[PDB]
Write a protein that binds this DNA or RNA. Sequence first.
RNA 1: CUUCUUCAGGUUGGACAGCUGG
Length: 253
Amino acid sequence: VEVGINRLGVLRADVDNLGQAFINGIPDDYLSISRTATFSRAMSRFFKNYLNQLLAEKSYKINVIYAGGDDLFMIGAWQDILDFSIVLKQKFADFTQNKLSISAGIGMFREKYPVARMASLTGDLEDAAKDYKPDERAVQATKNAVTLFDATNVFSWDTLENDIFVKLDAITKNFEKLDETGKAFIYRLIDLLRGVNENQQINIARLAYTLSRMEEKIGKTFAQELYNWANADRKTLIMALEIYILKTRERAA
RNA sequence: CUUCUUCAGGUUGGACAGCUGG
Ligand SMILES: [Mg+2]
Ligand SMILES: [Mg+2]
């Protein structure tokens, strides 16, 4: 890879409540050993065979360690892993036609990072995604989520795809003609957005000033769009901005 | 043989504003 940060991507996906589906997912009337075997074979053949075939469809830079049953462990270029996470979610949702959900954790590590710690950390992220519960009123976690590089960046799959990826696409399409001072301006935007929690007024003013400085190579309309996002959807905006910085980092790859 | 030693009127306007390269 030529553009991005020289980082390995570790993906760990797991179907939510597959054991519950095997216990009581099938209605009691349609319970037989043949139906149970059909469901088991569907799941197993999907994971093993179809993950192989789907990753062979386009030359993803992935190095699948294990697919097996209900689980997944793949290591590759972090951009390819991030791109294939949504493809995996969509293909699983098609295959099950939205009867089972999948949780994933995506870790980002350097090449010489310990493999034991890669596995442990990405498992922790996958557990955090399985801990996803948007409202503290329901019973049992929603579990249909993905964790992005850190246990604080747990987003649902719909949230991830729609919000984060449309924001990342807009940022990419509006930030490609920035200067090398613009990169530092994006860094400052990220720092200000992270600090907004402990600085309500001065920090939003500083963000407005930074957008003012930027709105000469990005346009006034997108500066206003970023300002609106910062006051409405901040954590998604921070996620998209960090992903853009890591994807466009010119420190080899 | 005379007094005025200066009085009156204008008192800034328009233009450019950061661009390239790593
Ligand atoms: Mg599971
Ligand atoms: Mg499992």
